Amino acid sequence: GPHSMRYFETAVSRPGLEEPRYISVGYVDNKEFVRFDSDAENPRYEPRAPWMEQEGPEYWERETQKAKGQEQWFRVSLRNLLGYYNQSAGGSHTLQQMSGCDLGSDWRLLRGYLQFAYEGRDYIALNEDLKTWTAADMAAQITRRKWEQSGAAEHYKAYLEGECVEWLHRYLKNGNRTDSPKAHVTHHPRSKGEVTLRCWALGFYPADITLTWQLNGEELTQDMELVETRPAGDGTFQKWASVVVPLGKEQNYTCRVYHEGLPEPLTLRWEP
């Protein structure tokens, strides 16, 4: 199937902190596999999935020293952004980065990513051509011009097409899974003359899933309540969707569960 790598990086300043905290989290196929945190007693990239312990000490020493460089890059960048936005001393500020590459099922590069946010809002991103930058804010154009003048994107294009794909291939080798939903309906009467059917889906991975309720053969988009998909904490996820029905008519309501691990969608009903 398709594959990906991402590094999510955060630098955080708070008024009661002299220096920013820097965190970098690496992902392969949307699961964390390495993490660097400057708050640690001895900061270093650390393995976060057992298959990563395969890597030797000079891997970790090299990644760790890059992270120390990135930490300083974020510090300087947070200081410059403060001036760009005419923000004074004495607030909390955040710089975020996501970067990485998407691979098709043939393991070829589909797309590389490099995006930044300041205060949780889009600041500047490398466009899909890996050659030009998009920046919305007036304050952001200062960065775009600098990076255009320095030709920074050339180095980023080379990473996203080169090392990002090459090392992602190495990682997919070293760690060479879906779990299907298990579904049931629970019965809860909301009032006299009405009943809530709750369709649960439990124990599934990946997290993406869809639950619907159908009348005859009628999807009921509004009127139906749901929860955001949530981690069970064991690696799997959960969701439910519920709808209010006249009692006795429970049998004319069918729930459907859509998930990429299923041979076909599940259909189910309340079972006395």
């Binding site: 890059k66 990135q70 300087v76 960048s77 410059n80 600098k146 920074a152 990473y159």
Partner: peptide
């Protein structure tokens, strides 16, 4: 393998 940013913002 994490990317190395060059020029600061």
């Amino acid at each position: 393998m994490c990317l190395r940013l060059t020029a600061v913002m």
